[PDB]
């Protein structure tokens, strides 16, 4: 309304406002010092407050884009430091904002962040809490200029939570370090998802994006009408389209809007939104997005009678098109939370192909009469990979599963860097631990999640790059995972002679290097050296001497060279 800054200050609260303002500026003006950003934020904050006090006061009626750009253009160094960004200041809105978006440099090429010693950190923390956090918030933001600021701020609050707890402890390190890793991990993942989703929307187009979204929202809100699910799909697609284009202010208004709508109609979407919708506004969009699947309504009628049996299937296909198809996906999805989204899409694609062929035929009804049987193999295929790998993980346990996987994939693609190999396989085994703990019903959605993050990591690794995996990485996200599972051994390295998990990683690095130089040797032979190696190290760590490691290792090398060839 009037004083919308006033509206956003009052909605966010002063502290969250200040944090977000900082992040926003940090992201555009990446090469400005900390002390300057703080002053910019304090200027904005003090102004904000005047508008709250009186909505009628000078400039309070401006939009947030005007006030934002105005503030950027006050900057003294703006031409010296950022060059053309200064030319944006000559333009009126909304061209000005646009012009500023262009000049956000994704890779600031600034020094990579050194984690200090936990002592020094916790002191910095205790000396000035605010400065310490803000500083880190600043440093992260200016390196990730495309990170939804509210999301950044959420991590920031868990950083603070970590410090407040782990620092008052006998081992700051025992408590603080895992959390810091976990957070940095989660954030890097979060980014990866966002980036993927945008690449896909651009690459595969809006339609594909909407298909995917219909599937996911139908599972999530199965008590919602087809017409409501379609509404939500539309709005979500616009928010994603907006957000990808990189404007924080529009992105956030559209997320706020979508959240607000969903909460106004909760009763018609999900029982599960009750608490989400009492959450403070920065929290609510984020909370809704991670809400659990609702119960699917009891005794829903058969999918087949509307699509397999009822007349007008080709009339409605031909009249409604994507809506008819959209409805199929919706109706299949809401009845099948046990499925991964990519599966539901494969099914949908199959039905749609069936209809293209059949509705072109003399007797369509005959030709599509038994389409549902075409689903049976598509559904069984992932179901069985789950069962089979889950049992092997249950038999073997995380560590040695990772090594079972380590062999499998070095054999299938030995060209790839073993580090990448060690890390992919290690992750996959963690995926296994994550997923097989769930009820079989909840495994396949769980897998699809944790695989997509792993498979993507691998795929973005292949930028500085093995020819075969590019096909899989440049497929539709639907058929990525099956294209990968379709790998077989390459079939077509010299011998160099040259601590908990880190020791394990070294052992694995060795295992891959063994399988490299020697791809051919069987699995009994791998088992042998693995055991003789387990025996060598236990022997020499136990021995009082370094000499034992030296003499045994030549013996172990020689012993296994013989047992090779």
């Amino acid at each position, epitope marked *: 309304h009037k004083s919308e800054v006033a509206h956003r200050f009052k909605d966010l609260g002063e502290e969250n406002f200040k944090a977000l303002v900082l992040i926003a500026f940090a992201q555009y003006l990446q090469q400005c010092p900390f002390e300057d950003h703080v002053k910019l934020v304090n200027e904005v904050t003090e102004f904000a407050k005047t508008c709250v006090a009186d909505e009628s006061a000078e400039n309070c009626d401006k939009s947030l884009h005007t006030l934002f750009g105005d503030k950027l253009c006050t900057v003294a160094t703006l031409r010296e430091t950022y060059g053309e960004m200064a030319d944006c200041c000559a333009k009126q809105e909304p061209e000005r904002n646009e012009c500023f978006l262009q000049h956000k440099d994704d890779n600031p090429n600034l020094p990579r962040l050194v984690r200090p010693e936990v002592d020094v950190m916790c002191t910095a923390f205790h000396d000035n809490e605010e400065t310490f956090l803000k500083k880190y918030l600043y440093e992260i933001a200016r390196r990730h200029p495309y990170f939804y600021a509210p999301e950044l701020l959420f991590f920031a609050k868990r950083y603070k939570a970590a410090f407040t707890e782990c620092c008052q402890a006998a081992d700051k390190a025992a408590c603080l370090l895992p959390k810091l890793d976990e957070l940095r991990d989660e954030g890097k993942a979060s980014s990866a998802k966002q980036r993927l989703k945008c690449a896909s929307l651009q690459k595969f187009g809006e339609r594909a994006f909407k298909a995917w979204a219909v599937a996911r929202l139908s599972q999530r809100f199965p008590k919602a009408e*087809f*017409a409501e699910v379609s509404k939500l799909v539309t709005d979500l697609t616009k928010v994603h389209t907006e957000c990808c284009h990189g404007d924080l202010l529009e992105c956030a208004d559209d997320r706020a809007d979508l959240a607000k709508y969903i909460c*106004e*109609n909760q*009763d018609s979407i999900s029982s599960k939104l009750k608490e989400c919708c009492e959450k403070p506004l920065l929290e609510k969009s984020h909370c809704i997005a991670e809400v659990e699947n609702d119960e699917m309504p009891a005794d829903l*009628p058969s999918l087949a009678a509307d699509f397999v049996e009822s007349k007008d299937v080709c009339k409605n296909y031909a009249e*409604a098109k994507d809506v008819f198809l959209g409805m199929f996906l919706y109706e299949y999805a809401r009845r099948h939370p046990d499925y991964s989204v990519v599966l539901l899409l494969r099914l949908a694609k199959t039905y749609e192909t069936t209809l293209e062929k059949c509705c072109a035929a003399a007797d369509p009804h005959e030709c599509y009469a038994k389409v549902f049987d075409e689903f049976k193999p598509l559904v069984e295929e992932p179901q069985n990979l789950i069962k089979q790998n889950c049992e092997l993980f249950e038999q073997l346990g995380e560590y040695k599963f990772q090594n079972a996987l380590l062999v499998r994939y070095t054999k299938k693609v030995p060209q790839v860097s073993t580090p990448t190999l060690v890390e992919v396989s290690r992750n996959l085994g963690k995926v296994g631990s994550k997923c097989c703990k769930h009820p079989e019903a909840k495994r396949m959605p769980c897998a699809e999640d944790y695989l997509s993050v792993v498979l993507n990591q691998l795929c973005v690794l292949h930028e500085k790059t093995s020819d075969r995996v590019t096909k899989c990485c440049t497929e539709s996200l639907v058929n990525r995972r099956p294209c990968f599972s379709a790998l077989e051994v390459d079939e077509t390295k010299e011998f160099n002679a040259e601590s908990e998990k880190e020791r394990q990683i070294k052992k694995q690095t060795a295992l891959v290097e063994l399988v490299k130089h020697k791809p051919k040797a069987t699995k009994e032979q791998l088992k042998a050296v693995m055991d003789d190696f387990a025996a060598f190290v236990e022997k020499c760590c136990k021995a009082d001497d370094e000499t034992c490691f030296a003499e045994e290792g030549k013996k172990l090398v020689a012993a296994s060279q013989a047992a090779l060839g």
Partner: nanobody, 126 residues
Framework: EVQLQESGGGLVQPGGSLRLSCAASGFRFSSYWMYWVRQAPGKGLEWVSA????????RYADSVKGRFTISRDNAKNTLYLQMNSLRAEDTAVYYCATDSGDGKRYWSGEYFYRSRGQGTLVTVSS
């Protein structure tokens, strides 16, 4: 059993007004999207407009945009359609429809529906 009953139809001059009402029962009206469809003499069914479960989310066919205002009163299970700036070509039978389910589906040209009423005749001429 879904039950709809339209009313308020009748004859008006070009550029006149009407207010169609529709009485719902047999389903939880307040939790479902409601539509207005129409069929001109000799023509196919047209989608006219749509409203969400709560209200405050309305859509309109291009032709009627700016002219007709759909709304609902959930307290009364009544769907309204306020027809202003009427035209000769707006002469048709106006049904109200819903997708309350477990039933056969039909295409209105923007939304599938499941049940519609008897209709109300609107004539616009002279």
């Amino acid at each position: 059993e879904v039950q709809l009953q339209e009313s308020g139809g009748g004859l008006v001059q070009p550029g006149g007004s009407l207010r169609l009402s529709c009485a719902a029962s047999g389903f939880r009206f307040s939790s479902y999207w409601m539509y207005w469809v129409r069929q001109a003499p000799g023509k196919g069914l047209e989608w006219v407009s749509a409203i969400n479960s709560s209200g405050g989310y309305t859509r309109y066919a291009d032709s009627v945009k700016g002219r007709f205002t759909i709304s609902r009163d959930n307290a009364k299970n009544t769907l309204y359609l306020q027809m202003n700036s009427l035209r000769a070509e707006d002469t048709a039978v106006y049904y109200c429809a819903t997708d309350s389910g477990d039933g056969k589906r039909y295409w209105s040209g923007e939304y599938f529906y499941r049940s519609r009423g008897q209709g109300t005749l609107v004539t616009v001429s002279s």
